[PDB]
């Protein structure tokens, strides 16, 4: 896939944040560009690591998740603060763990596909045949090739490791061999980290990327800042993305025989509700949309069974009825939303 | 496939009141069945709607989670969030959850083997009495004397093992507990409010970051197998009097879409809890004293003054919720529970005068 | 066991002196065990053991009641100091060490059975026959049933884990203990054990703190409460003689081994109890444990010469007690 | 052994400290008295533990060492401060490991006799193959005992025969019986864990199950601590035994204070004890062909030298005698090879010559 | 070995220069080993090794005496830094010692196998595979793995460096290490995968500068387990000149044979050696005194140009003279910052 083909696929899931989509696409394209090179340059070239920057919940992780899911690559998210108190080599360990017929012959074959120890026996042959078809030395060694060639690692909240300054910067030095390249031992095999791609992310409000150790700053060639989502983006996130949470709730109630429909003004007042809570108390980003939506739909989701065969409409009046009383009280909103 | 009203109606048989918490947990369990009906793509994108219970201790937050999992026959575990402040790894939650799912699926599988094994064990022991060369007449004549009762007597126990071992399938069982954990698993994290936010704030919020992969989804290794946490349901609870859910790390606040506050229990609810729930503690004491041949009966005014006694202690000193009912009842019944052997064949009646006699002197002194 | 609660206390009176309320409280818990088994399938799960919290000064027999109670029921038993977990070891070790005691308990008891049949069918033959007679799956699984059904655990000095820095570590131990009483499942090399029906006995002086200082989930898991009274001088005189295999009876048979006959006068027993009481008041009160230190100091001269005194009848009188003791009791230093 | 026989044997090694000798003798004698009792009392009776008290180096440990060596019992010395940092159960584990090597080497001593007889009968079969002892059978038995792969083969038969004679289930289980019935443990510097007060008293609670009785798992087997005897020791100048936790104070029924050694005690310790350090240096130089002899005034000035150092700097007790003696004899001990066939005399003038400049 | 104490010192003089008191002290300990075996069954248990405490500034040869002493006795040896345990279990000392004794007795057993195997392999005949099968056929593992245990228990030697640094907060952890070391000297038994070893008869050598602390600051139980005390003197400029040449396989002799490998012949003038010792002394006085270790840093700095060109210099005879030493050094010794 060309870099524009990657961004266009990411637009199907993430909304906006095109600069982060363009930056990740360059890294994945360099993978294919490297394989076309000669024996010497393939060793000298190393992945272009990315450092995402921005407030929480704007989709930094989702880009890394959909990117690895787009490439079918191994992926893991690790909190950098986990190591302030486990060995750093566990990152690669957990990454590898995630990585002509007779007439009676047809007459019985028909009754078999139609359905029918006998019934238990069909399941045991799937194991014996799939084991006979599978190649374990080509499989356990494939996950190693999938990690080494295609592997991806997302390091969240890297800005928080910038008394404590020795332990904080000590985690950076422990992370250093993985990016500069090294070899880690695992029960599944011996993995090399040279060509693994990495994505670090942090708000960087307390610290700056310059505060990172110099050896780490040079191993993160690509830098990108992700913009904060607005109320208008909340309305888009509720609907536009494939399998959006509103589409999920609609199909969920459809299973009960109920038909949910959201008005544009009803969607607009949900985004306004999630925005008010982030401003009134604490800003969690687009994550607030999930808490507000379930609070609005809790009465329908409970009653949907008796509501089978009915068409429910979520309007602006319905949103204000179940929400504005909760959003008006900030003491309650921190608990309930 | 129970509908959400069927879930609360079942929960009303045990928990009293707290309907909003019942409605909230029912929505999460129903989304499980609603997800399976969806297509291949949506089943991955949809994730469990996690709940945050809030309220004073002892109002039934855990009992809702306990009866909900018991209602679904799902694996369940309660974990204290403060255990990780000191230390143990956070991954142990899934490990201990699978160990409960293993024993759960195993004992339930024994319930299946308990039947078939007795039939195959009988056919084995009849081969020694009537060796083979429609059941034979002597085959039934011995089969009758066997069921009537009778090394020989030890032999029937050994065949239950060999037959249940011959009947059990370990690859469908140990892999069943994994499917029970991944699909149906439930985890209750008590006192999550105590890990909210300088020195402790790093160790407190560090536990939140350690918990983060389990809710965002991850893979944990266990001796029983490799489990994925993506579809596991979680229930966090806390009083949140010192802190508020907004004090939680932002990645955690968005992984708890459903929030509910549980109301403080009243004196009237205490009277209902003593009697109304199936196998209520009063019914338990009644059958226990029946074992000794004694008949316990509680008057409505006697039940009313026990609930008033437990309420006064929670207000006079510390409010433990409905847990106070257990301490008060045993203190009232301790004299009968000691004498029940000698009281066999007698009808004892717990009245308002009896409750005040054994209690009011104790409740009067804080 | 089907013993009625009065039969339990009467058996406990053979060892412990006084503290009847603690005896009555433990008997109710053991009787509820037999009462539960007669119930139906539903109530047997809902009913849970009535846990007891002993309260009182050290050395008044809190542990002995739990020890003799488990010994009376032939149940597995373990004593654990709650402060051990302040530093560290996992709390689940309680069930692990309990099963290890239950394993050795059911094994040595199973040896007593195979001891009989193997001698008929038969040192080497005792092993082959007992192995031929034993069914290890009924034994290692018996200790599990003995722990789950009959198990008992005594948690000493629980008052010291009550409630800023230590209060987190102190109350943290309470939360770690919480699953065991509320019920849970612990994995052991011997098997998988469930804690739902295990009985527990917590004890503490509670002079610094109070049971109300315990976490609320823990206060509701200890339905039965009892306070143990301080021992008097008269109880010391009873402890010296009345209990089966009392320390005076132990010294008598010990000297009987050497051919010597010890006999204690009532006034001689009376002045030993007065001696142990004065030391507890003059310096520090250790409870009935003082009786052990005072008696050995009195008998050290007889115990030393007992070989040469074979064939003699020695009498411990009030004059003998004052001769070897009062000079020592007079100096508190 | 009766308690007077124990103290009299202890006097052959330790000098003075009779009260500590009388106290340890009562504990070892209660062991034999318990076995003679009935089934019930043998369980109820528990060892009478001892708490030694006094300044360092006065022989507290030597009493425990010679006591266990007198009883052939397993023994271990453990520093209580080792657990301040970090498990207490290792005490029983290391105790059994010493008991394993103790019973094993002692079992080799038994097989040492019979195996030489059976090994000789094996080696005579190759020299005198069989078709009253034969003429050549004795003729080779004589040349064999006179001395002579051949020479290597006699060692291999000692293993096969000692293995054929030994019963390992009676051995690894014997060390367990030696630990449970006869075991002894010396806990040095117990006073330093008295009321850090949480970590100090926490070690006491960790030690509590071992004295109150418990069961510890080991690779060699499962051991019970109920009947093991223990000896705790401490200077108790900073703290007192009353500062110990109450459950620990009642598990130490016997208390004894050991007196500080005097200059007169030093002179006795140098000579009177069996295999005293002066006797050791004498036999060592005798190996080189030299004769050491110490004058009474020369012994008197060595004791005065060790006393002055303990007073002038730090008092280490009788341990000072070892450092002073080796410093005096270092010139002889080096030259002992060339001094063979000579009689050296250690006099007061010799002691002052090599020492007083240092003191 | 039956060597007398003077024979031990005379052999030590072939390697170490001076420090005769430390040589006499170590010789008395090794001789007591042979003196003990001649005693009866009783005295052999009661007598215990006379442990030594070396004292002096760093680099004066405290370790070299312990190394050459064990190498002289063919005994197992290990050097352990006492500060390693301030933060591993102390029992690892005996474990690592047995691991050195295992490889010591094994390679030495190969020296007996290297000969016989070649004869039996010739009779069989691939030549490399038969050395294994024959050496495995000739080797006795129960006499070997048990030999290293006898070598550790009877002949074992341990050197504990910088013991003076373990003499309120650190004082507990510092003195805690002493108590952990105490059982090893008083005698004990340690479990190892190779077997069960007893420490009663092992000899130990502790060393420290003792400028911050004194041996009296050691715990009393440890002071009595170190009967022999010796102080090692600081090396002079004249001693540096001797250390460069006199000792067998001296660093000057090592550099000469190294350049001989390239076909070059190195020769040092007496004045050239004299100006090397003067160079190392000036650095120790001008900045920090590291002892004789300064000789290694100065020599390699002087010879770095020859060591670089030695390939192209094959067949040539080099002479290190006073003019050559001053040319490559005095400019560096001048500037103390460099
Ligand atoms: N641009 C976006 N498109 C789709 N979903 C989003 C977007 N931004 C946030 N989300 C939702 O909010 C959550 C974002 O969390 P995460 O990406 O881990 O935070 P961050 O991006 O700060 O690392 C995800 O669960 C995701 O479903
Ligand atoms: N509504 C209720 N119905 C029935 N029992 C209750 C109720 N509330 C509390 N209880 C009893 O009190 C205890 C509640 O403890 P728990 O539910 O763990 O506290 P919380 O709800 O604060 O987490 C349980 O043992 C339960 O038997
Ligand atoms: N009432 C009693 N009857 C018999 N022995 C007693 C009694 N009280 C104390 N003892 C003796 O004193 C000791 C009591 O210790 P323990 O019971 O552990 O203390 P606590 O009761 O405070 O937990 C035991 O060794 C026991 O032999
Ligand atoms: N009374 C004594 N008799 C013989 N040797 C003694 C005596 N007192 C001390 N020693 C010697 O001094 C050392 C005493 O150390 P130790 O007994 O461990 O000290 P403590 O008695 O304070 O525990 C031993 O090496 C021992 O040889
Ligand atoms: N007297 C000496 N004879 C020979 N070499 C010595 C001498 N003194 C020091 N050395 C050399 O210097 C180094 C001394 O280090 P070491 O002996 O470990 O120091 P220390 O003696 O302080 O323990 C060794 O590498 C050794 O080669």
Strand B347-350 and strand C191-194: the pairing is unpaired
Residues of chain D with Cβ-Cβ distance to E52 below 8 Å are none
Question: What are the residues facing C193 on neighbouring strands?
Answer: C186
Question: What are the residues facing C209 on neighbouring strands?
Answer: none
Instruction: Give B331 Cα–ligand 2 centroid separation in angstroms.
Output: 19
| Number of residues in chain A | 337
Contact D316, D57 (CB under 8 A): yes
Q: Subunits that touch chain B (at least 3 Cβ pairs < 8 angstroms)?
A: A, C
Residue E92's Cβ-count burial label (10 Å; 0-12, 13-18, 19+) is middle
- For B132, list phi and psi in degrees, rounded to 5: -65, 150
- Do residues B226 and B273 both lie within one domain? no
Task: Name the token pair of B81.
Answer: 């969030």
> Cα separation of A224 and C219, whole Å?
55
Tell me the CB-side half-sphere exposure of residue E207, using CA atoms within 13 A.
23
- Do residues A84 and A207 both lie within one domain? yes
The CATH number assigned to the domain holding B97 equals 3.40.50.300
- To test the pocket of ligand 1, the residue of A204, A205, A225, A286 to mutate (highest count of ligand atoms within 8 Å of its CB) is A286
Residues of chain B with Cβ-Cβ distance to A202 below 8 Å are none
Instruction: Give B276 Cα–ligand 2 centroid separation in angstroms.
Output: 15
Contact E245, E202 (CB under 8 A): no
Method: X-ray
The DSSP result for D76-110, as a single string, is -EEEGGGGG---TTHHHHHHHHHHHHHHHHHHHHH
Which residue in B70, B68, B72 sits closest to B24, CA to CA? B68
- Reduced to 3 states, what is the DSSP secondary structure of residue E79? strand
> Cα separation of B185 and B183, whole Å?
6
Regarding the beta carbon of B325 and ligand 2, being less than 6 Å apart is answered: no
Q: What is the DSSP letter of A236?
A: H
Which residues in chain A are followed by a discontinuity, with C-to-N distance exceeding 2.5 angstroms? Answer: 85, 99, 116, 162
- Reduced to 3 states, what is the DSSP secondary structure of residue C156? strand
- Do residues E73 and E178 both lie within one domain? yes
Helix axes E20-37, E5-12, angle to 10 degrees: 140
Helix axes E127-138, E92-124, angle to 10 degrees: 120
Ligand nearest to the CA of C202: 3
Distance in Å, alpha carbon of B4 to nearest chain C alpha carbon: 25
Domain limits for position B51: 1-103+178-262
Judge whether C188 is annotated as a binding position: no
Nearest beta carbon to residue B4 from set A84, A127, A305 = A305
- Do residues C74 and C33 both lie within one domain? yes
Question: What are the residues facing C263 on neighbouring strands?
Answer: C315
Task: Name the token pair of B146.
Answer: 């066997």
> Cα separation of B80 and B92, whole Å?
12
- Do residues E225 and E249 both lie within one domain? no
* C109-C111-C116-C120 Cα dihedral, nearest 10 degrees: 170
Helix axes D277-287, D319-335, angle to 10 degrees: 10
- Do residues E271 and E165 both lie within one domain? no
What b-and-e string marks burial along A41-63, b requiring 16 or more CB atoms within 10 Å of the CB?
eeeeebbbbbbbbbbbbbbbbbb
- Do residues C169 and C291 both lie within one domain? no
| E189–D313 CB contact, under 8 Å | no
Q: Is the dihedral of CA D177, D180, D183, D185 positive or negative?
A: positive
Which residue in E203, E197, E198 sits closest to E225, CA to CA? E203
Give the resolution value in Å: 7.1
Which residue in E93, E105, E90, E190 sits closest to E150, CA to CA? E105
Q: Angle at the Cα of A64 (from A63 to A65), degrees rounded to 5?
A: 90
Contact D9, D25 (CB under 8 A): no
Residues of chain B with Cβ-Cβ distance to C171 below 8 Å are 82
> Cα separation of D44 and D32, whole Å?
15
Contact B293, B36 (CB under 8 A): no
CA distances for A324 relative to A279, A282, B135, D132, D338, angstroms: 15, 18, 76, 116, 108
> Cα separation of A113 and B197, whole Å?
60
CA distances for E126 relative to E123, E130, E131, E133, angstroms: 13, 7, 9, 11
Q: Which residues sit with their C-beta closer than 6 Å to ligand 3?
A: C 15-19, 58-64, 156, 203, 239, 243, 287-289
Nearest beta carbon to residue D44 from set C58, C81, C250 = C250
Helix, strand, coil % in chain A, rounded to nearest 5:
60, 10, 30
Ligand nearest to the CA of B263: 2
Q: Angle at the Cα of B279 (from B274 to B282), degrees rounded to 5?
A: 35
> Cα separation of B106 and B85, whole Å?
33
Question: What are the residues facing D234 on neighbouring strands?
Answer: D53
Q: Which residues are CB-neighbours of A55 under 8 A, at least 6 positions away?
A: A203, A226, A228, A283, A285
Q: Which residues are CB-neighbours of D197 under 8 A, at least 6 positions away?
A: none
- Do residues D347 and D211 both lie within one domain? no
* D270-D271-D274-D278 Cα dihedral, nearest 10 degrees: 60
Residues of chain E with Cβ-Cβ distance to D64 below 8 Å are none
Task: Name the token pair of B74.
Answer: 């799902």
> Cα separation of B128 and B138, whole Å?
12
**Rounded CA Rg of chain E:** 24
Contact A186, A93 (CB under 8 A): yes
Tell me the CB-side half-sphere exposure of residue E136, using CA atoms within 13 A.
6
> Cα separation of E324 and E319, whole Å?
9
| B253–A287 CB contact, under 8 Å | yes
- Do residues B299 and B286 both lie within one domain? yes
> Cα separation of B137 and E22, whole Å?
102
> Cα separation of C93 and B300, whole Å?
46
Helix axes E270-286, E294-309, angle to 10 degrees: 130
> Cα separation of B148 and B125, whole Å?
14
Q: How many CB atoms lie within 10 A of CB A23?
A: 22
- Do residues E246 and E304 both lie within one domain? yes
* B29-B31-B36-B40 Cα dihedral, nearest 10 degrees: -140
> Cα separation of C102 and C97, whole Å?
9
Q: How far is CA A178 from the centre of its chain?
A: 22
Contact C6, B341 (CB under 8 A): yes
> Cα separation of A32 and C189, whole Å?
51
| Closest residue CA from atom 9 of ligand 4 | D59
Beta-strand runs (E) in chain B: 51-54, 76-80, 186-190, 219-222, 225-228, 233-238, 258-261, 295-298, 347-350
Task: Name the token pair of E25.
Answer: 């002290």
Residues of chain D with Cβ-Cβ distance to C290 below 8 Å are 250
| B327–C222 CB contact, under 8 Å | yes
Task: Name the token pair of A108.
Answer: 């019985």
* B9-B11-B14-B18 Cα dihedral, nearest 10 degrees: -100
Contact D338, E6 (CB under 8 A): yes
Q: What is the DSSP letter of B197?
A: -
Alpha helices, DSSP H, located in A36-135: 39-44, 60-71, 90-98, 103-113, 121-133
Regarding the beta carbon of B273 and ligand 2, being less than 6 Å apart is answered: yes
Contact D88, D208 (CB under 8 A): no
Nearest beta carbon to residue D202 from set C83, C303, C304 = C83
> Cα separation of A293 and A141, whole Å?
45
The DSSP result for A41-55, as a single string, is HHHH-----EEEESS
A301 touches B: beta carbon within 8 Å: yes
- Do residues B89 and B210 both lie within one domain? yes
Task: Name the token pair of D26.
Answer: 């009562």
- Reduced to 3 states, what is the DSSP secondary structure of residue C67? helix
Distance in Å, alpha carbon of C261 to nearest chain D alpha carbon: 14
Task: Name the token pair of D24.
Answer: 């340890």
* Residue that the structure tokens 């506050």 belong to: B261
Tell me the CB-side half-sphere exposure of residue C318, using CA atoms within 13 A.
5
Instruction: Give A286 Cα–ligand 1 centroid separation in angstroms.
Output: 7
Task: Name the token pair of A152.
Answer: 């991806």
Nearest beta carbon to residue A305 from set B5, B38, B216 = B5
| Closest residue CA from atom 15 of ligand 1 | A57
Residues within 8 A of B (CB atoms), C 8-27 only = 24-25, 27
> Cα separation of C175 and E265, whole Å?
79
The CATH number assigned to the domain holding B312 equals 1.10.8.60
- Do residues C243 and C321 both lie within one domain? yes
Distance in Å, alpha carbon of A211 to nearest chain B alpha carbon: 20
What b-and-e string marks burial along E149-168, b requiring 16 or more CB atoms within 10 Å of the CB?
bebbbebbbbbbbbbbbbbe
């Amino acid at each position: 896939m060309t870099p524009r083909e990657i961004v266009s696929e990411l637009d199907k899931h993430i909304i906006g944040q095109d600069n982060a989509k363009r930056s990740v696409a360059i890294a994945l394209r360099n993978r294919w560009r490297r394989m076309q090179l000669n024996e010497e340059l393939r060793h000298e070239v190393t992945p272009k690591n990315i450092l995402m920057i921005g407030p929480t919940g704007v989709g930094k992780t989702e880009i890394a998740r959909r990117l690895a899911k787009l490439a079918n690559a191994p992926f893991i998210k690790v909190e950098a603060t986990k190591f302030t108190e486990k060995e750093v080599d566990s990152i690669i360990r957990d990454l590898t763990d995630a990585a002509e017929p007779s007439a009676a012959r047809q007459a019985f074959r028909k009754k078999l596909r139609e359905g029918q120890k006998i019934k238990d026996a069909m399941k045991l042959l799937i194991e014996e045949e799939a084991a006979k078809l599978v190649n374990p030395e080509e499989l356990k060694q494939d996950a190693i090739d999938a990690v080494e060639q295609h592997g991806i690692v997302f390091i969240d909240e890297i800005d928080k490791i910038c008394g404590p300054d020795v332990s904080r910067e000590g985690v950076q030095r422990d992370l250093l061999p993985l990016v500069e390249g090294c070899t880690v031992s695992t029960k599944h095999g011996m993995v090399k980290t040279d060509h693994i791609l990495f994505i670090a992310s942090g708000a960087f409000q307390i610290a700056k990327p310059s505060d990172l150790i110099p050896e780490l700053q040079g191993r993160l060639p690509i830098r990108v800042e992700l913009q904060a989502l607005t109320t208008s983006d909340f309305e888009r996130i509720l609907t536009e993305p494939n399998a959006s949470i509103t589409v999920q709730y609609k199909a969920l109630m459809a299973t009960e025989g109920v038909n949910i429909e959201f008005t544009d003004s009803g969607i607009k007042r949900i985004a306004e509700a999630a925005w008010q809570v982030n401003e009134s108390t604490e800003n969690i980003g687009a994550r607030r949309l999930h808490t507000v939506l379930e609070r609005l739909m809790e009465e329908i989701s409970y009653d949907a069974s008796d509501l089978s065969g009915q068409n429910i409409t979520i309007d602006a009046d319905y949103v204000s009825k179940h929400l504005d009383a909760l959003v008006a009280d900030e003491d309650l909103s921190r608990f309930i939303l």
